[PDB]
Design a protein around this ligand. Structure first.
Ligand code: ZMM
Length: 127
């Protein structure tokens, strides 16, 4: 029932890049999802204490959220776009794993994921 530490957003010994694809993931993908009317449950780690979800971190062992992704992008945490795309996919998948089909949170994830897929469909060619 307690919260775990959040995912890492800083690691000075992890090698970093700022590729044109990563810039797109920030300027296009994250900004589009962040401003969406359904973004708010995804803008920070799930607070299992405040939300009374004592089993959330029993079931979800790879937590991820847009607040974390935003920090990772703004602090140039990633080497490549695939790492960040995997973070978005982890976020969506966690929601579908934990919750029931048709729950409000699942509908919200599905709306965000539809936009995510549209934006990643036009991920620019590297350099
Ligand atoms: C991804 N996610 C998110 C929420 C969820 C909804 C609303 C609000 C917040 N907030 C606000 C600040 C801290 C916080 O946790 C999380 C949620 C709630 C119930 C069941 C499942 C989920 C879920 O799967």
């Amino acid at each position: 029932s307690m919260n775990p530490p959040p995912p890492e957003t800083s690691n000075p010994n992890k090698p970093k890049r700022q590729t044109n694809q990563l810039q797109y993931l920030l300027r296009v993908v994250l900004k589009t999802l962040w401003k969406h009317q359904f973004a708010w449950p995804f803008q920070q780690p799930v607070d299992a204490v405040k939300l009374n979800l004592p089993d959330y971190y029993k079931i979800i062992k790879t937590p991820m959220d847009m607040g974390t992704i935003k920090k990772r992008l703004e602090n140039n945490y990633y080497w490549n776009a695939q790492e960040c795309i995997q973070d978005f996919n982890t976020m969506f998948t966690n929601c579908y794993i934990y919750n029931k089909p048709g729950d409000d949170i699942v509908l919200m994830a599905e709306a965000l994921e539809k936009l995510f897929l549209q934006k990643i469909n036009e991920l620019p060619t590297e350099e």
